[PDB]
């Protein structure tokens, strides 16, 4: 399987939570992380 | 740059004038900076490390002293440290005493409690004793490397705005340097005032102030152990066992 | 049920201090002693050490008899607890320290002591000087010596850069306390009176040296 | 038989003060505590809150374990009692306040305290300044700015007419106490020492500013 | 929470009003400045809800929204 | 057997731990140590 569903879940949770609380970038999330989150959402 | 001052009294037009040279005040200000003294001490330690490095002595000092078989490295390290300290005292002689012998001690049975490096005359040549287990126990002891010893505002403002030498290795280097400094003070009294005075000093370190300040206090640099004022915790309570109804008329050491 | 990890950490720290294997000066309370003793009792392979330190409650009851394999196993146990060398004199230091800690009364302020009662021949510094003295000359030297002080500006700059983040005061504290503890342990092991007048006079000499 | 309405009113007022959700400064007596506890016990849907506050009698007995549905239900119960936002930190404030009130001895004069023991990392103001500091710069700003001060006499006259009956002193008291309570709650929640020297020096600065 | 423009405008207008009160000659505040709204305790200052900082390029103002909400 | 599998162990660790613990090393170790570790890994 190409997708490491566990790591993808971790990144998706990180960004979604981050965004679940605020409304900004908070520049230690990197485009990758977005990509990570979106891929996780697709797979799940 | 020079600064001129004029004094005038109300009885006449006379003015008496003095010229001050600012370099003296600048020197005092520089000597009052904490970073300056820190840089001086760290530069001395860096020179010591570089001197060891050019002598191939790159291995950690603890590893050097842990090798029982290879005595040549221990002898070279101690000799180099003694020579470095001698050059620090006298910045004109690059080579230490041209001939001296080394004996390494591995037993408590022939160990001196508190003077790991000792010097003696065998009627023919200087001999230096090295207590290897004592130095190993010194360097191998775990160090307090997370506690803080007493500027937050400058850090706050900043926030709003390749040899691998760890802290343990640097502390080991400083420990050996201070130990050899103590040994070199004993050796200096030896060489300059005789074996009798050397063995008198071994049992009473208070003669250092009289046998150093006469020549060293006005000619050489500052000693490494003088960078900080060291005191024993609760010294008075522990010393209460030996208290004298004293009358000190020759208090040559405050 | 007790927390093995917390008790093990407290035991590790207290034994590190009480063995003079570390200069970390952390204020130790009675709770740390309770935790170290409880952990020593509970852990199966520290039973020898627990019995050894518990025998210190009464001054008339001295060290239990251990065959060589038992002493070696206890040394390995101490080494594992400290994850660090360690030998019999370290165990003697620990025994004396724990004996003096246990027999001490409960008190509001920490009691500052010096190492004592370790290792018949009660001597002083001068007799040791003479005696061990020859035992030295008896040995023949190994090496005969019969010097580059490079000031490479770039190299010293790199060395200073590496050393710059180090808090010089901490390094001096570590070095001085290490020398003091080694000297005290050598004095106590050699059964020689440690004259702290002389050791403090060393620092007084440095202080008097600087201001001239 | 007890009067549910009077006990409920006393509980409402005492909890409003003890939750820092109101600036109403009314002298509270032991009778109000008795009434609030009795009402909390008697009302079926405040049993969780009553047990929560009763556990505060002994400092060693800490908060009961509640699953998420229970915490949500207790939050709704507190909201209904206050008819007001309210969240977990309000419950923590209430727990600390009631614990300190209960463990306090019976005394003739009201004891004035500050909020404490709410929310491991015991910090000060400067480390928080640095730390949270970046966590700020880490965030990107939302808006970019790159001004009418109308003096319409009739409009200001109407505004003054609307504001005229308001007792300015009461408004200032409310605003100042609100700022003080928000600052104290932020300090206590962040586990940072609240230095009332600085806060009082703010007022001293204003006073010194005026007379020049 | 969603509409940040109103919060930024309110804080900027209040700052400009206070600035004009201090200096009754300048009607427009600092011509360029940025706003960041804080919704978390993790990045909140205990006692200074509105804070200012320089990002080496422009003034930046921090607004602790939950603190102001709890106040009002 | 040419390989002293026991001695070849510690070495590995020392580095493996040492390297895992601290990315960079110094004179503390030797090329002998690296060879020791690699030979151990091969044999095991």
From Swiss-Prot, chains A, F:
Sequence similarity: Belongs to the baculoviridae C42 protein family.
Compartments it resides in: Host nucleus; Virion
Source organism of the structure: Autographa californica nuclear polyhedrosis virus (AcMNPV)
Transmembrane intervals: none
Name of the protein in question: Protein C42
Subunit structure: Forms a complex with proteins E27 and p78/83. The interaction with p78/83 mediates nuclear translocation of P78/83. Interacts with protein Ac102. Interacts with IE0.
Function: Plays a role in host nuclear actin polymerization by recruiting p78/73 protein that is capable of activating an actin-related protein 2/3 complex to initiate nuclear actin polymerization.
From Swiss-Prot, chain E:
GO terms under cellular component: membrane; viral envelope; virion membrane
UniProt entry keywords in alphabetical sequence: Host-virus interaction, Membrane, Modulation of host cell cycle by viral cyclin-like protein, Modulation of host cell cycle by virus, Viral envelope protein, Virion
Coiled-coil residues: none
Similarity section: Belongs to the baculoviridae E27 family.
Ranges annotated as spanning the membrane: none
Predominant location: virion
Location within or outside the cell: Virion membrane
Subunit structure: Interacts with host mus209/PCNA, cdc2 and cdk6. Forms a complex with proteins C42 and p78/83.
One GO BP: symbiont-mediated perturbation of host cell cycle progression
Record's function text: Acts as a cyclin-like protein and plays a role in the modulation of host cell cycle. May promote G2/S arrest by interacting with host mus209/PCNA, cdc2 and cdk6. The cell cycle arrest is characterized by an intact nuclear envelope, concomitant with sustained activity of host cdc2. However, viral DNA replication still occurs in the arrested cells.
Organism: Autographa californica nuclear polyhedrosis virus
Protein name, per record: Occlusion-derived virus envelope protein E27
